[PDB]
Design a protein around this motif. Structure first.
Motif, short mmCIF file in Angstrom:
data_model
loop_
_atom_site.label_atom_id
_atom_site.label_comp_id
_atom_site.label_asym_id
_atom_site.label_seq_id
_atom_site.Cartn_x
_atom_site.Cartn_y
_atom_site.Cartn_z
N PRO A 134 0.82 -1.21 0.00
CA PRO A 134 0.00 0.00 0.00
C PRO A 134 0.85 1.26 0.00
CG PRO A 134 -0.81 -1.57 1.61
CD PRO A 134 0.51 -2.08 1.15
N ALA A 135 0.24 2.35 -0.45
CA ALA A 135 0.96 3.58 -0.76
C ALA A 135 1.48 4.31 0.48
CB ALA A 135 0.06 4.51 -1.56
N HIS A 136 1.11 3.87 1.68
CA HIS A 136 1.60 4.53 2.89
C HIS A 136 3.11 4.42 3.04
CE1 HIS A 136 -2.59 4.64 4.64
NE2 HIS A 136 -2.71 3.66 3.76
N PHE A 137 3.76 3.52 2.30
CA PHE A 137 5.17 3.23 2.49
C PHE A 137 5.96 3.59 1.24
CE2 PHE A 137 2.31 -0.01 4.14
CZ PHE A 137 2.43 0.19 5.50
N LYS A 138 7.23 3.96 1.46
CA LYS A 138 8.07 4.44 0.36
C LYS A 138 8.46 3.30 -0.58
CE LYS A 138 9.49 8.56 2.55
NZ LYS A 138 8.67 8.34 3.79
N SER A 139 8.94 2.19 -0.02
CA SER A 139 9.39 1.05 -0.82
C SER A 139 8.22 0.10 -1.00
CB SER A 139 10.57 0.36 -0.14
OG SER A 139 11.05 -0.71 -0.93
N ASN A 165 9.09 -6.41 7.27
CA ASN A 165 9.60 -5.53 8.31
C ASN A 165 9.34 -4.07 7.94
OD1 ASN A 165 11.80 -4.19 10.17
ND2 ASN A 165 11.69 -6.35 10.77
N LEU A 166 8.95 -3.28 8.94
CA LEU A 166 8.66 -1.87 8.70
C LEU A 166 9.91 -1.11 8.28
CD1 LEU A 166 6.85 0.66 8.87
CD2 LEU A 166 7.42 0.76 11.30
N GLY A 167 11.09 -1.55 8.75
CA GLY A 167 12.32 -0.88 8.35
C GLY A 167 12.55 -0.95 6.85
N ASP A 168 12.25 -2.11 6.25
CA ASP A 168 12.38 -2.24 4.80
C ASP A 168 11.30 -1.46 4.07
N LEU A 169 10.15 -1.25 4.70
CA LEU A 169 9.07 -0.50 4.07
C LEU A 169 9.35 0.99 4.04
CD1 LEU A 169 5.95 -2.40 5.44
CD2 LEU A 169 6.61 -2.15 3.05
N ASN A 170 10.03 1.52 5.05
CA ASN A 170 10.38 2.94 5.13
C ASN A 170 11.87 3.06 5.44
OD1 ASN A 170 7.92 4.13 4.52
ND2 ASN A 170 7.23 4.17 6.65
N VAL A 198 -6.11 5.68 7.94
CA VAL A 198 -5.68 6.53 9.05
C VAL A 198 -5.03 5.69 10.14
CG1 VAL A 198 -6.41 8.34 10.63
CG2 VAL A 198 -7.61 8.03 8.47
N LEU A 199 -5.62 4.53 10.45
CA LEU A 199 -5.03 3.65 11.45
C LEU A 199 -3.65 3.18 11.01
N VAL A 200 -3.49 2.85 9.73
CA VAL A 200 -2.20 2.40 9.23
C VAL A 200 -1.15 3.50 9.38
CG1 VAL A 200 -0.94 1.71 7.18
CG2 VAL A 200 -3.14 0.67 7.69
N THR A 201 -1.52 4.73 9.02
CA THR A 201 -0.58 5.84 9.17
C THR A 201 -0.21 6.05 10.64
OG1 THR A 201 -1.06 7.07 7.15
CG2 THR A 201 -0.50 8.35 9.10
N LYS A 202 -1.21 6.00 11.52
CA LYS A 202 -0.96 6.20 12.94
C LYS A 202 -0.02 5.12 13.47
CE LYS A 202 -5.07 8.68 14.48
NZ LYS A 202 -4.47 9.97 14.90
N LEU A 203 -0.26 3.87 13.09
CA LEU A 203 0.60 2.78 13.53
C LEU A 203 2.01 2.95 13.00
CD1 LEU A 203 -1.74 -0.32 13.17
CD2 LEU A 203 -1.10 0.92 15.24
N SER A 204 2.14 3.35 11.74
CA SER A 204 3.47 3.51 11.15
C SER A 204 4.27 4.59 11.87
CB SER A 204 3.34 3.85 9.66
OG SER A 204 2.69 5.09 9.48
N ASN A 205 3.62 5.69 12.24
CA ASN A 205 4.34 6.84 12.78
C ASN A 205 4.25 6.97 14.30
OD1 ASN A 205 1.79 8.02 13.28
ND2 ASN A 205 2.53 10.03 12.64
N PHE A 206 3.65 6.00 15.01
CA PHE A 206 3.76 5.83 16.46
C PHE A 206 2.97 6.84 17.27
CE2 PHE A 206 7.77 4.31 14.59
CZ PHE A 206 7.60 2.97 14.85
N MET A 215 -6.35 2.37 -0.97
CA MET A 215 -5.04 2.15 -0.36
C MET A 215 -3.93 2.21 -1.39
SD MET A 215 -5.51 0.81 3.14
CE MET A 215 -4.19 -0.41 3.16
N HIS A 216 -4.16 1.64 -2.57
CA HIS A 216 -3.14 1.60 -3.61
C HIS A 216 -3.27 2.79 -4.56
CE1 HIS A 216 -1.18 -2.27 -2.87
NE2 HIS A 216 -2.37 -2.72 -2.49
#
Ligand code: YAT
Ligand code: MG
Ligand code: MG
Ligand code: MG
Ligand code: MG
Ligand code: MG
Ligand code: ZN
Lengths: 139, 96, 212
Positions: free
Chosen positions: C20-25, C51-56, C163-171, C211-212
């Motif tokens: 999904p587009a929330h992530f850079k990679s 892993n979130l590290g590979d996603l951002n 919104v939940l995905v963004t919140k989870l990604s950015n803590f 999402m995409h």
RNA sequence: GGGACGGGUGAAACAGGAUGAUCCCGCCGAGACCGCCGGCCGCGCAGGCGCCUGCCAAGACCGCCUCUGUCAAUCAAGGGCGAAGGCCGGGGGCUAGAAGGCGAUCAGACACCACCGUAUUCCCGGCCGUAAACGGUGCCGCCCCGCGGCCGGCGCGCGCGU
């Protein structure tokens, strides 16, 4: 192998698989699987390289099996792997065997790039009753 | 005669305690009488940690650790040298 | 008994997997599959742990679960499925001398999802405290649990999957949890252990498109 | 999905595998149990007590220029509670596992080690009334060197720190 039977090549990144290591006290397993644990690319065991039942989990057998697996997966077109090392677990020893480190070093010295490493040993939030009785293995 | 004032266990202000199983023989032992040690180790032995880091593609990666609590019975701890038989005066020492 | 069979990898082909587009990679990788004898129906509803590290490319101890819901243009489209931390971090959190609060709540979204969220926390010792243990009285623990419930309900009561995905990604939820709990007492760690999806609507196509 | 061993031991051998095992992954069913935190912490008359949420009654401690006015201590007889195993009558059936079977070791091994496995282990109603049921120290009450740690409550002091 025809090119369409292999992962698409791209200098941007290299194909990533997942390696599952079972470092038991009686045998060792090296299993390579795609990102989703449904497609098996290569599977080898330490008991395919020894004649004595007591040396199945030894480091030497693990190294030979890892070499064979390296050959197979390189033939199938894989370059990097994540690692998922595990023990018996499930109300058991919860400690790695002696073949896991051997397999990891063989992979490292076999020209493979490494990604992430994690523990995958099964552990319960709480367990059933184990064998042995309330006096244990008296021997 | 009595050998220890604690009777070989740390049981104060209670009548019964929950049991645990030895990790070597699977004997059933009281929680207050079992010998416990906490260990922290790398998943990979330090000999090949440098090799793995060299091979690793990630940047800024850190080697994960393993956190385990080992519990042993009286017989197994002595056999494996986890604890030792001491002199009468040394038995009172409580420092490592 | 023993018999020889042809090599199965002479009839396989690969697909790409996208995030999904929330992530850079957005290129997770590729998956093998056998040619139709249907691939587009067999590579569906497959789950990938990324892993979130590979996603951002603070992120290396968190991973996401993504599930394919549609195949189009020779690519697999995925959306949210779960969230978890690593085992070593979980083992590292625990410490002798302090107590811990482990809460869980069931939260319904606006898109028809029901989520189960697990929250963990630990207590710490004051800077100038005579004793060495960090135990606390019961009323403090009850107040901490109540505050956790209140903050979770107010920050995720009416939220959508993006919104939940963004919140989870950015803590952000962790930020409010620690901010609120610190008003009760010392709080060494306060995060979300993991998120589970219990039931979702059968058809999720507009959600996937967004999402995409 | 993939293709040849897997299990177990000091070393092995019985049970498993081209009727595709072991291994990876996803789903489904049932029944137990409550981990790392967890302790010279705590509660309870003792036996004993650890998932989330809600309900119900209870208890010791401290604080007090609140109430009564000896209403107390200990106790044959008598009454109640009482680990685990065991029994009666109904439910439930996953782990483990008396009895039983089988492979090893041995001079022998019907035991210690390996494997399968009935009663039991779980719930409801009721019997039994025993334990190294141990702090091997009966209950009430007075005086009594010094140092120190932890738990609960209250008060004093200041430069306000749990
Ligand atoms: C309880 C099974 C016994 C069966 N054997 C006899 C032969 C034998 C020969 C050995 O030399 C290599 C040996 O070394 C470990 C073990 C055995 C076993 C011994 C078993 C007897 C058992 N009680 C006595 C002492 C002992 C010591 C042991 O060493 C750890 C042992 O291993 C499980 C078992 C026993
Ligand atoms: Mg012995
Ligand atoms: Mg003596
Ligand atoms: Mg007792
Ligand atoms: Mg009973
Ligand atoms: Mg007596
Ligand atoms: Zn042990």
């Amino acid at each position: 192998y025809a090119p369409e039977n292999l992962p698409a090549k791209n200098n941007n990144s290299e194909a990533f698989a997942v390696c599952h290591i079972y470092a038991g006290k009686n045998d060792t397993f090296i299993h390579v699987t795609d990102l989703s644990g449904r497609e098996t690319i290569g599977r080898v065991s330490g008991g395919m390289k020894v004649k004595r039942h007591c040396d199945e989990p030894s480091a030497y057998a693990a190294m030979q099996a890892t070499q064979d697996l390296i050959e197979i997966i390189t033939d199938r077109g894989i370059t990097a792997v994540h690692i998922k090392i595990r023990a018996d677990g499930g109300t058991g020893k919860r400690v790695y065997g002696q073949g896991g480190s051997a397999a990891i070093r063989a992979l490292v010295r076999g020209g493979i790039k490494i990604g992430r490493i994690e523990d995958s040993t099964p552990i319960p939030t709480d367990r059933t009753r184990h064998k042995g009785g309330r006096r244990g293995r008296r021997l | 005669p009595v050998k220890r004032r604690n009777n070989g266990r740390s049981k104060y202000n209670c009548g019964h305690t929950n049991i645990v199983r030895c990790q070597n023989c699977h004997r059933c032992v009281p929680k207050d009488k079992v010998i416990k040690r906490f260990t922290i180790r790398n998943i990979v032995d330090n000999t090949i940690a440098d090799d793995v880091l060299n091979a690793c593609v990630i940047q800024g990666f850190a080697i994960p650790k393993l956190y385990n609590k080992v519990q042993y019975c009286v017989s197994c701890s002595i056999h494996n040298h986890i604890v030792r038989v001491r002199s009468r005066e040394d038995r009172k020492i409580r420092t490592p | 008994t023993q018999r020889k069979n042809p090599d199965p990898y002479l009839k396989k082909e690969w697909y790409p997997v996208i995030a999904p587009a929330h992530f850079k990679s957005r290129h997770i990788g590729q998956t093998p599959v056998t040619k139709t004898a249907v691939a587009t129906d067999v590579i569906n509803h497959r789950v990938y742990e990324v892993n979130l590290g590979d996603l951002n490319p603070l992120n290396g101890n968190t991973k996401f679960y993504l599930q394919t819901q549609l195949v189009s243009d020779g690519k697999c489209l995925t959306n949210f499925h779960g969230m978890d931390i690593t085992r070593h971090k979980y083992g590292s959190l625990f410490r002798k001398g302090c107590d811990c609060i482990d809460v869980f709540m069931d939260i319904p979204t606006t898109d028809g999802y029901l989520l189960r969220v697990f929250v963990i926390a630990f207590t710490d010792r004051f800077r100038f405290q005579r004793r060495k243990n960090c135990h606390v009285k019961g009323r403090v623990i009850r107040m901490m649990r109540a505050g956790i419930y209140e903050t979770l309900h107010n920050e995720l009561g009416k939220v959508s999957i993006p919104v939940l995905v963004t919140k989870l990604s950015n803590f952000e939820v962790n930020a409010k949890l620690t901010e609120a709990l610190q008003k009760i007492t010392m709080c060494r760690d306060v995060m979300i252990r993991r998120v589970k999806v219990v039931k979702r609507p059968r058809n999720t196509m507009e959600l996937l498109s967004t999402m995409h």
